[PDB]
Symmetry: C2
Subunit: 143 residues, 2 copies
């Protein structure tokens, strides 16, 4: 409770550059609170993550998601898991920030774009090189 609890959702399926962005976002998020992710759950479970391993990852991640004060998601790469975390987050009435790169050529899911209300659920477009500045802008106004 000392610090805001932040939960981050993102995909790394696109390779090294996706991993670097993932780490860049999580690193800047730490400025503004404690950060938990599905990667942290999978890292802690190690070998047990195995038969039934995905169930333990899911239960641990959902437990952290439910406790979060803000849920941040990078929604550029299509991802069932990121969509699912967002859907659970909405039903937990979490404040949500989604980050999208229009550079990707992609059209953001209508279901995700359609969930934004401008305040409690927001979708921010960004380019390579400004995600740290935008995260600052978001959290320096709404810790």
């Amino acid at each position: 409770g000392m610090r805001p609890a932040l939960y981050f959702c993102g995909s790394i399926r696109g390779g090294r550059e996706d991993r670097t962005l993932y780490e860049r976002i999580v690193s800047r998020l730490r400025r503004f609170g404690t950060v938990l992710t599905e990667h942290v759950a999978a890292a802690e479970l190690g070998a047990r993550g195995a038969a039934g391993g995905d169930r333990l990852i899911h239960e641990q991640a959902l437990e952290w998601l439910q406790q979060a004060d803000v849920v941040v998601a990078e929604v550029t790469q299509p991802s069932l898991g990121v969509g699912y975390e967002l859907g659970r987050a909405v039903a937990f009435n979490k404040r949500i920030l989604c980050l999208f790169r229009p550079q990707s050529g992609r059209v953001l899911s209508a279901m995700i774009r359609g969930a934004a209300d401008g305040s409690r659920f927001q979708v921010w477009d960004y380019e390579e090189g400004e995600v740290e500045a935008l995260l600052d802008r978001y959290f320096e106004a709404d810790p």
Copy 2:
């Protein structure tokens, strides 16, 4: 009245499979999907917001949610997330022959009962639906 079924889905194999699944689900109930919401649009600003609110209403009304989860999709995941919170019975369908490893968050959502994740090969999808729904 009839059981209300909500189908979540996203390539030739993919389109024909979507069509096959929706067709077979009609044997058990009426079927609504996100594409039916989008087709409601002819025009636009606020258009995605309308799709979202319409799909959410149909999802909340559904007796069973069925999702094809072979292709990565933020929408299908979002729908599943909302359906879990709506305490809905959920059936996900995954094709291992895709070469992909299903998302841990989806595979791990399964509890064997109200949330089930079934691997399948394309030729047997109608038979699996028959098994679930009869």
